[PDB]
Amino acid sequence: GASKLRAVLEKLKLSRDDISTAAGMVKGVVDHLLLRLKCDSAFRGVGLLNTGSYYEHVKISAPNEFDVMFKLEVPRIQLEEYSNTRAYYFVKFKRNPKENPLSQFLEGEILSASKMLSKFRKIIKEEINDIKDTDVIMKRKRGGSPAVTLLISEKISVDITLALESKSSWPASTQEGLRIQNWLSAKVRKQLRLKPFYLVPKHAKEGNGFQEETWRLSFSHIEKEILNNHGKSKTCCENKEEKCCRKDCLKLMKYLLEQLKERFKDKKHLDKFSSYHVKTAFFHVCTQNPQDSQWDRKDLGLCFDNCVTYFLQCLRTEKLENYFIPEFNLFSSNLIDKRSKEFLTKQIEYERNNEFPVFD
Ligand SMILES: O=C(O)Cn1c(-c2cscn2)nc2ccccc21
Ligand SMILES: [Zn+2]
């Protein structure tokens, strides 16, 4: 029902005002933090990376929650892949001169994530304590990559993550990734792959213990660009004759998962699932249907059923390739146990069989 779904989306559009006001409230604090952060010799080249659901224009239903990324430029780095993970790497440095301002964090030849995260939280703390014009508090440490967590005006929660920026060529694991050749063209793929890639501090788990000095690949900027320039036609969604329902589908998937996570928040089954899974699956569906005509607005129902159908498959086969790192499985049994996937499958299938009552 392309009408009921659009009723849901119209209902969703009402939150944009509050999400934008809160976004402004966040930006005000963030800019200050960055200006002050640029003072340290180590975090000199720190900058703001404007990516995420908000800048992708798909952020919904969470005004008091935000995620921001601080990017830092590392000139020349030698990357060492950790145990065929294809996504996690050790950061070494190409040259010998102590031009490196991060020499202080170098634990051996390998760059330590723990040390730099410590200095990051320390400086951020020292600076949030200084300003009293804005009621900003620093929350306790729980997460890994989203290392810093702030509370603005005792209302807004901001997840601050650190990211290294490398202008070098993308790692070999991304070779067969970003299959947009038949969709956004090969010229565009080449242009995009000429852009830098990022690394967020994350630990991998091979078993009982952890490796705490690893960095995981990040391409959020590429995701942003792909999302905000999503058509085979350059004038896609710029006129009435060329209006597609891609972003609508993504929004609907996100809302579906959100509602389902809210319905069973007390049972912890769906805790491991996030919106990135939905986004990834969506990108795969975009690759499957490269034509704008396959995303016509009038077919909003069908297209949505195409996305769900794919996502479900990913849940059943326990396979969801990272759109940039094909050999990395987001839905591997190591990451998410079968019981959770089967539960999510059960619920989604129920919803689809009862005309999505969760949409009302
Ligand atoms: O860090 C990011 O940019 C997002 N991301 C997630 C993820 C899982 S739940 C939210 N995000 N899993 C990944 C695995 C490999 C590379 C990137 C991955
Ligand atoms: Zn479009």
From Swiss-Prot:
Top-level taxon of the source organism: Eukaryota
Outcome (variant: S145A): Enhanced stimulation of interferon production. Does not affect chromosome localization
GO cellular component: cytoplasm; cytosol; nuclear body; nucleoplasm; nucleus; plasma membrane; site of double-strand break
UniProt KW Ubl conjugation keyword: yes
Binding-site positions, ATP: S53, E65, F66, D67, S220, H221, I222, E223, K254, S275, Y276, H277, V278, K279
Impact after mutating C236A: Abolishes DNA binding and enzyme activity
Result after altering L12A: Impaired type-I interferon production in response to DNA stimulation
Important for preferential detection of curved long DNA (site feature) positions: K27, L35
EC number of this enzyme: 2.7.7.86
Effect of substituting K234A: Abolishes enzyme activity. No effect on stimulation of interferon production
Phenotype for K98A: Slightly decreased interaction with histones H2A and H2B
Residues with lipidation of kind S-palmitoyl cysteine: C244, C245, C314
Annotated positions of the N6-methyllysine modification: K346
Known catalytic reactions: GTP + ATP = 2',3'-cGAMP + 2 diphosphate; GTP + ATP = pppGp(2'-5')A + diphosphate; pppGp(2'-5')A = 2',3'-cGAMP + diphosphate
Outcome, altering D31A: Abolished poly-ADP-ribosylation by PARP1, stimulating interferon production
Induction: By type I interferons.
PTM annotation ((Microbial infection) Deamidated asparagine): residues: N50, N229
Extent of motif KRKR-loop: 139-142
Name of the featured protein: Cyclic GMP-AMP synthase
Residues of the full protein shown: 161 to 520 of 522
